[PDB]
Design a binder for this molecule. Structure first.
Ligand SMILES: *[C@@H]1O[C@H](CO)[C@@H](OC2O[C@H](CO)[C@@H](O)[C@H](O)[C@H]2NC(C)=O)[C@H](O)[C@H]1NC(C)=O
Ligand SMILES: *[C@@H]1O[C@H](CO)[C@@H](O)[C@H](O)[C@H]1NC(C)=O
Lengths: 39, 245
């Protein structure tokens, strides 16, 4: 992607997608407040 | 974290605790950007005034911690930004920590994304809220048992500059509520080095926009927390990782 897996390690391609939330279609208790501010 | 609230399990799997190897002591927060690289503030590593200047052997990191499965990692090397001069302003307050060995990911250990030009352009805007997490003092002056979280609005640059006497560079931005906001909240001592993250409404990924840098008092109304503009220093990050990764 933007970095090289060889020196960056693993994780970039899947970065920022939480196992217990985004990964299973779940949202935390206050992320909506963040979303609202973007509109 | 002041005026924050308890974290849900796995709400910030990229949170990292920077510890002074026994003599054990929590020194700062940090974030996981990959299974071998950890991001934090330069002043957490080097700040003579507060008597700080650790080597890879002085520190230690704990990853995947929800309550005070989870791993403890040693540091291979530490890289403080070259143009960082504590003897001045705290500009370019950023540092990279290379783990001795890769940390396997889990439900509580997952990296945060680093921002791109378009993400910053559309999200790092006045009024937009980001989230800060940390084990900093719950009270300005005392520590939490569970990771704390708080959402803060990005403040207009003119407003930031007018709130303090300290010169504010383009490598920083501030966040926090206005004196008239009914809401309060801020990062404190111990939250330094921690991540300021925003969730993209375009790809639902969480990006780290800032690093808790400094603040005049914790949650002082009329004052705002300052953060390192991670994107503006992404070139350096790239350099270090390509060169020493
Ligand atoms: C922070 O700690 C550094 C390591 O001890 C120290 O570094 C250096 O100074 C010695 C002088 O005794 C040199 O021989 C050594 O090569 C220098 N560092 C490196 C990386 O090569 C720093 O001076 C200490 N910081 C302050 C502000 O005093
Ligand atoms: C005062 O607070 C309100 C929210 O309660 C905000 O919308 C308003 O813009 C703030 N004052 C100024 C001068 O911006």
């Amino acid at each position: 992607t933007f970095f090289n897996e060889k020196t960056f390690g693993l994780g970039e391609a899947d970065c920022g997608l939480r196992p217990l939330f985004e990964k299973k279609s779940l949202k935390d208790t206050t992320e909506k407040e963040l979303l609202d501010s973007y509109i | 974290i002041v005026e924050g609230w308890d974290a849900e399990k796995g709400i910030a799997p990229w949170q990292v605790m920077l510890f002074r190897k026994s003599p054990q002591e929590l020194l700062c927060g940090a974030s996981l950007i990959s299974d071998r690289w950890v991001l934090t503030a330069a002043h957490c590593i080097l700040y003579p005034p507060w008597d700080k200047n650790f080597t890879e052997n002085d520190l230690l990191v704990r990853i995947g911690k929800h309550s005070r499965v989870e791993k403890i990692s040693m540091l291979e090397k530490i890289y403080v930004h070259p143009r960082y001069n504590w003897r001045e302003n705290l500009d370019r307050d950023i540092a990279l920590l290379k783990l001795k060995k890769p940390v396997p990911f889990s439900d509580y250990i997952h990296p945060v994304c680093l921002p791109d030009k378009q993400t910053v352009t559309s999200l790092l805007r006045a009024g937009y809220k980001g989230r800060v997490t940390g084990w900093g003092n719950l009270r300005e002056t005392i520590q939490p048992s569970v990771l704390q979280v708080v959402n803060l609005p990005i403040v207009e640059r003119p407003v930031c500059k007018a709130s303090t006497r300290i010169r504010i560079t383009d490598n920083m931005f501030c966040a926090g509520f206005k004196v008239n906001d009914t809401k309060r909240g801020d990062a404190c001592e111990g939250d330094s080095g921690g991540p300021f993250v925003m969730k993209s409404p375009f790809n639902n990924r969480w990006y780290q926009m800032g690093i808790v840098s400094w603040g005049e008092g914790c949650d002082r109304k009329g004052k705002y927390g300052f953060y390192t503009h991670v994107f503006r220093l992404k070139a350096w990050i790239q350099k270090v990782i390509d060169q020493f990764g």
